[PDB]
Amino acid sequence: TGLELLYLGIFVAFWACMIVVGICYTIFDLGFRFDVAWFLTETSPFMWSNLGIGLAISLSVVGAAWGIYITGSSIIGGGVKAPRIKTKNLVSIIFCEAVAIYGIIMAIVISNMAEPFSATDPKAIGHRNYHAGYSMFGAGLTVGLSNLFCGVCVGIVGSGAALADAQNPSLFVKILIVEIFGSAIGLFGVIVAILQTSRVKMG
Amino acid sequence: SFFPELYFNVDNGYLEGLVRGLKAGVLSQADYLNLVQCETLEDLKLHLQSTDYGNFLANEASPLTVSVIDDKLKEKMVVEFRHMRNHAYEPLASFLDFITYSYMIDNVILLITGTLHQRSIAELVPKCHPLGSFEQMEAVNIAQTPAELYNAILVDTPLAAFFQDCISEQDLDEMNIEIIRNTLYKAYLESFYKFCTLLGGTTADAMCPILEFEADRRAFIITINSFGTELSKEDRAKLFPHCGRLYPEGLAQLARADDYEQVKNVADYYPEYKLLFEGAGSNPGDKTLEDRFFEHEVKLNKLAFLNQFHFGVFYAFVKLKEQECRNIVWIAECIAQRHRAKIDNYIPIF
Amino acid sequence: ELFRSEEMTLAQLFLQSEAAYCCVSELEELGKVQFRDLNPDVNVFQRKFVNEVRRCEEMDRKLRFVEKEIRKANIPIMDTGENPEVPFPRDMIDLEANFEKIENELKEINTNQEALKRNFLELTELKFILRKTQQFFDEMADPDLLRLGFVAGVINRERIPTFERMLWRVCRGNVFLRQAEIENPLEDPVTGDYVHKSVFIIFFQGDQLKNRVKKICEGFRASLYPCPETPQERKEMASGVNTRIDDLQMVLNQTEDHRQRVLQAAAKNIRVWFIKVRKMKAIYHTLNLCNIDVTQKCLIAEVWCPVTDLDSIQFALRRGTEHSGSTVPSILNRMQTNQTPPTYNKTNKFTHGFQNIVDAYGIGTYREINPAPYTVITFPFLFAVMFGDFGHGILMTLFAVWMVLRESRILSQKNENEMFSMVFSGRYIILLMGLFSIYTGLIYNDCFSKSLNIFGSSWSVRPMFTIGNWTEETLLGSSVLQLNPAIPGVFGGPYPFGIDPIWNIATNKLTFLNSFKMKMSVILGIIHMLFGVSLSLFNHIYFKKPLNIYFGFIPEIIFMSSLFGYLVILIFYKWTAYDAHSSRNAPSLLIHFINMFLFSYPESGNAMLYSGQKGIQCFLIVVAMLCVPWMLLFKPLILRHQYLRKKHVFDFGDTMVHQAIHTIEYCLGCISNTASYLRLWALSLAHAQLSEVLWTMVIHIGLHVRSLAGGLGLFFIFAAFATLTVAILLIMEGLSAFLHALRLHWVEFQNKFYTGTGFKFLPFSFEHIR
Amino acid sequence: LCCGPKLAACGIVLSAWGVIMLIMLGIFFNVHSAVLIEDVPFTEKDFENGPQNIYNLYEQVSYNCFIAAGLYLLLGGFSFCQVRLN
């Protein structure tokens, strides 16, 4: 658990530092320096928007790959004694990849809303552009993380389904319903991302 | 929860599927009935050829014997387990090595028994169980010196950890081999339970019940068998594994126990064991306590297959196939001895 | 034909035992008959003819052993092509005698050859020892002819130092040893290698030293043999061993010639023996599946057969009767059945690849719309939509044409390369893929990442300076500039065939290709899915499921067309309507589809594509959502009514759950499949960009060289370019595009009409020809 | 110089591919196809007066391509001779 120890140490140190820093800023009357407004505002909307698109695609692909390996290991292991698994349970892989297809679709939809400003002063950048960056970032987070979780869930369920099919052929047809239910979550994330970026306009 | 779902299949998913496929080949109740309906060992092989076993027994001599069938079943299981171990990674490799320590214990007991009786260790090798082979050469060509053999075990055997329960090599000639074996097994079971708990997750959840039942049954049977012997209560209590559910005052009551009635009274407090002891009529013609415990062990090993992302599947499969090989050997024995009356004593699996 | 599986029917044959073997042999030759186990109660290993099958297996083992000896020897194995039938009469005795001779003779020959070679080597060692001992005993042999003890032997060279040291260290300074090299190194008696040797002679005093030296040599793995004690004995035994050596050499040569002759005779007909015995084994194993005298002296056979071939099977039975000489004729009979018939597609040489391709995901049910004939084009076409490249398609079609032309050669010369065997079996698939990839590369105007400009681009740059507001000053000031078609003469119509060449050199390339290819992918996918749904209607009509036709297909087609076919109509309408002048207010069909689904028609933003869009889109959405209850509620209720209120197991809850699952699956599948068909655009853009980057990183280096010396560098740079194109693009990207067209066909297209819950027809056809 | 027939076949197929493709590339460069402008090794000065300089550079690159095609023709001849030997 060396790497987990390192991560836990970093987390604890960072958040102890944050606690003491917040106590200092509040108590020493230096709160006006902790300008979250200035952070969110000076930080360019392009950073948020492009991080959002990148996350939308990358996390969707991460979930698709996670599920694909989770279920393909089981498919190939079971098929050593019952090769029909390879031909039948490719549907789990298909779902895990539909996750990434949703990811790219939403990356396209988000990227279609990008446009330069030609301004640097926040009053010039305006609510429209700032909210556009924030909402593209949020939509990317939504789609990417929902797709990641849906892909992992479908992969786990598909590994289970492949293992169960390796022993009795008539079970996969009934266990695919769990895969469908797990797939619905990616669709929900896509719908929410689309709603978020519905009225988004950079320029 | 540990969330093994996320990472188990990274390293052990292929082997999980493979071992489940192997388990799907264990004879079912219908297959056991078909084998039971046979008349000769040749017909037993004939019927068995239709199961997953296939032609494992076609090569061997036409005058089949129970010994030949048993050795072939043992060889098949050894081959499958060795393949799985060879394809396993670190954590599952340690799990499978722990599975093999059980037979390594009996093998080292055989080695020390032969050596104390001045018999060649190389000549003792063939009788050892294949799954516990001492491939190390430090414990070979010992020249029949118990001290050299003890040093070899300590230096070049995974049993060095369990041999610290003893105090010196003089213990080999001092203590009886059965007490040595059971002390080694207590230490091994405790270490195995600790390792499974450290693994945690679905492995611990699905495996700790099996080790706990092993500990409880070891306690019960040691108590029931040491009643008429010179094994004192104090030296007996040292042989109860502490993994079982009897650890608080249960093992103590067993140690103080002086009769099977007292052992049954102790078992009453735990309903799971209460039913086994109630069904263990122990009179001729009905299931014995060992048979009831075998049934419970098979049930637990089968329930080990309802979890998915855990190593307990491999231990359960090894034990279930051991039980299946024992069942087939028993059926062959009944066929050969013509004692068809007791041919149903085999414990079914799946 | 390939439209749907052949009419299949059960049949049962009564055939007298004497003629049964010949009749089933004729059936095996014909190949249109599939037997079935009719005695499953008793396992295979206990049936009537297991004795015969066991003896046949033993004969096959004998033939394998003789063939293995044939391979060990250099002798080749002939190939005539004849396929004689196993002799129904008891010619098995003659064949067994022949093979027993051909095996026993070869085994005796091998054993005798080994033993006689060992003896010959030992005797030649003895001869050399005698000759060298005579040479040593030649200082001055004045006498013509016992305390001293004598031995002699042979050692491996370079062991002389260690052996001499060991002797002088054990028999301390009381033994004599002389050594002499043996030129023309010899072959070891047992170790079996050509190694240099030294013949050595040892003199010793008494019995103790005799034993010492004997054991020392035995440990040194030498060999001693006896030796003469007088010159007369030396001469006598030397002559004897020389004569025996010559005799053994003659016998060795004769026996080796005998082995060669018998093995040549065996190889002359080994293949015919193998085919004979393999058919005989197969025929007897088939007769095992038939009823036996436990029920009737006349054999009973049960078979699947296509309806059209019944007369041919009867004629084959007539041949069997005539050959067997039995007066009684075997009789075939039909019988109405309930068991599920298999799927038989009458595959052809050209259609075998596509039929295997569509069968991989499940053998089609009995007599349902076969996707193969449409796949024959749509799989190459979908592959080409992604792999589209004129040059790579040229390479692939040339390779596929080579495989097609030389197919007979490769078919004869069989190898174990699984990958190459797969490709060769798919040769026609690769050929069509190459052709359609050529076509799609022409449409993309792509050839090794470069366009063609065969008709002339519609984009003229001069109107920009003539009418537009440009000048050389603007060209100097702008790094990339851009172009517009709003001014009159810039855009002179669409390119007549394929994408315009100027997009190749336009940095705006991707901005346009992305949209065009996304629309193309969506259009092709939706039309493919609609064709699948129509095929599903055909399936239902043939199977007589009006329930499915009225609830199911029609709701499915209405839903699909209203939601996603309307999208294709929107794409085409926008293309035909909106131009450069109306560019500013050109709507986004993505946003319009989102708003269609969300009922979010706003009063701000992009305007409506056409008048009445709000009403028409609301109506389409309403119909689409209504198609969900149409599929879900109706069919279960009618089923429950007509199968539980009439006539009165039916489980209404389970039926409702099943229909709900089917409706959810289909409705989510429409969306997910229209999305997944974007893999066409994804893979096409990937192939194009990989080809472009490969070109610009490999052969741009060899082309962007002023000095004429670059012509030599282009040699190696293009070697690298060719290997990289063949490896990264033709092999791996081509394989990916192939498998993704496969996945599209298996899931997106075939889920609409295909079931794949049948059994492959495995006839009793003789494939032992192998 | 005897060598494997597999290597000879690979060499001859590569020679044919190189000859055909490089001859076509040279012909297109010589025709001054605008598609391959990026491959011309021109400089800033070449845009001074007119397109004649870029045409000359096009011709130079076409000559390079024809030289490569001739070298591949020699390589294919060597491979064919090796095939005849084998």
Ligand SMILES: CCCCCCCCCCCCCCCCCC(=O)OC[C@H](COP(=O)([O-])OCC[N+](C)(C)C)OC(=O)CCCCCCCCCCCCCCCCC
């Ligand atoms: C168990 C852990 C050990 C306890 C200590 C933990 C480490 C904390 C020390 C960090 C190093 C910083 C040292 C001071 C650096 C100089 C800063 C400076 O100029 O100050 C100006 C700051 C800010 O400016 P100012 O307030 O002085 O100026 C006036 C500003 N206006 C007008 C707006 C009000 O204030 C000070 O003068 C601070 C002096 C004391 C600072 C001491 C460190 C603060 C944190 C202490 C630990 C907090 C947790 C306590 C409980 C823990 C119990 C487990």
Ligand SMILES: CCCCCCCCCCCCCCCCCC(=O)OC[C@H](COP(=O)([O-])OCC[N+](C)(C)C)OC(=O)CCCCCCCCCCCCCCCCC
């Ligand atoms: C570990 C899990 C997370 C929880 C702990 C960490 C949370 C915060 C970590 C992020 C960095 C620090 C954030 C605060 C930054 C300072 C903001 C600031 O100065 O403005 C304050 C603001 C404004 O300050 P101001 O000076 O403008 O005051 C207002 C003055 N007028 C109205 C005239 C303008 O007000 C507050 O005090 C808000 C409270 C939050 C600040 C304190 C943070 C507490 C951190 C945790 C310690 C809690 C103490 C008790 C410990 C036991 C807990 C159970």
Ligand SMILES: CCCCCCCCCCCCCCCCCC(=O)OC[C@H](COP(=O)([O-])OCC[N+](C)(C)C)OC(=O)CCCCCCCCCCCCCCCCC
């Ligand atoms: C100079 C190079 C030019 C480019 C040439 C190569 C282009 C790249 C794409 C080629 C892909 C080849 C695979 C498709 C062909 C096989 C399909 C077919 O008809 O066979 C039915 C195959 C094999 O034939 P079969 O043995 O089943 O035949 C039927 C026999 N009975 C009826 C007795 C059972 O059948 C199937 O199993 C169907 C599923 C096929 C799915 C294909 C999986 C991918 C295979 C990858 C091949 C290897 C990669 C390339 C390596 C190249 C280096 C050597």
Ligand SMILES: CCCCCCCCCCCCCCCCCCCC(=O)O[C@H](COC(=O)CCCCCCCCCCCCCC)COP(=O)(O)OCCN
């Ligand atoms: C707990 C006391 C207080 C601590 C406060 C200080 C802050 C925490 C620092 C760590 C404190 C504990 C000591 C841990 C040492 C490092 C972790 C273990 C050793 C280690 O790193 O080696 C292996 C990984 O390889 C490597 O060496 C690779 C590591 C290098 C990667 C660097 C990239 C990470 C950058 C950080 C940003 C990411 C943030 C993520 C939240 C892990 O060994 P094992 O576990 O396999 O074997 C078991 C034994 N090692």
Ligand SMILES: CCCCCCCCCCCCCCCCCCCC(=O)O[C@H](COC(=O)CCCCCCCCCCCCCC)COP(=O)(O)OCCN
């Ligand atoms: C027990 C545990 C501790 C619990 C206590 C809560 C801890 C929260 C940690 C965050 C920090 C504390 C929140 C209050 C401090 C806010 C900053 C005040 C300082 C200040 O004056 O800034 C104004 C702007 O702040 C603003 O207007 C910023 C408004 C937003 C503040 C809150 C945002 C915190 C981050 C939340 C992220 C959540 C992520 C969810 C996934 C000035 O601006 P001005 O207009 O006067 O400028 C004038 C320029 N000329």
Ligand SMILES: CCCCCCCCCCCCCCCCCCCC(=O)O[C@H](COC(=O)CCCCCCCCCCCCCC)COP(=O)(O)OCCN
């Ligand atoms: C480059 C731009 C154009 C690209 C787009 C068009 C590409 C078309 C691809 C199809 C052309 C190749 C067809 C295969 C040629 C090899 C023949 C194999 C054997 C053969 O004759 O196959 C028969 C099947 O019909 C056939 O072989 C079919 C032959 C007639 C098909 C007509 C349709 C061609 C496409 C539409 C017209 C052309 C449009 C483009 C100008 C039956 O096998 P067998 O009896 O020989 O088997 C003997 C053992 N059983």
Ligand SMILES: CCCCCCCCCCCCCCCCCCCC(=O)O[C@H](COC(=O)CCCCCCCCCCCCCC)COP(=O)(O)OCCN
């Ligand atoms: C197995 C195959 C299954 C079917 C596959 C095909 C998919 C079917 C999709 C649903 C049915 C057809 C589409 C209905 C939605 C309306 C389509 C409008 C298309 C469009 O943009 O046309 C413009 C509107 O037409 C107008 O201005 C006229 C009024 C609006 C349209 C009226 C309805 C036309 C379609 C009739 C039904 C066709 C059924 C096809 C199956 C042209 O107008 P513009 O540009 O000149 O005007 C503009 C200034 N005002």
Ligand SMILES: CCCCCCCCCCCCCCCCCC(=O)OC[C@@H](O)COP(=O)(O)OCC[N+](C)(C)C
């Ligand atoms: C191993 C098997 C063999 C493989 C065979 C592969 C063959 C590959 C050969 C080509 C590879 C290189 C691609 C380069 C393509 C660009 C050439 C090009 O554009 O051509 C046309 C130009 O010359 C003319 O166009 P222009 O001068 O710009 O305009 C004038 C055109 N009007 C007159 C019609 C208006």
Ligand SMILES: CC(C)CCC[C@@H](C)[C@H]1CC[C@H]2[C@@H]3CC=C4C[C@@H](O)CC[C@]4(C)[C@H]3CC[C@]12C
């Ligand atoms: C090692 C990990 C835990 C990080 C260490 C804690 C960090 C946040 C601490 C350690 C020392 C601290 C510094 C100590 C002193 C000063 C001087 C003061 O006028 C401004 C803040 C400043 C510059 C502090 C900023 C915060 C600081 C850098």
Ligand SMILES: *[C@@H]1O[C@H](CO)[C@@H](O)[C@H](O)[C@H]1NC(C)=O
């Ligand atoms: C000046 O440039 C504008 C913008 O492109 C163009 O529309 C206009 O026609 C030009 N005016 C001239 C050349 O007089």
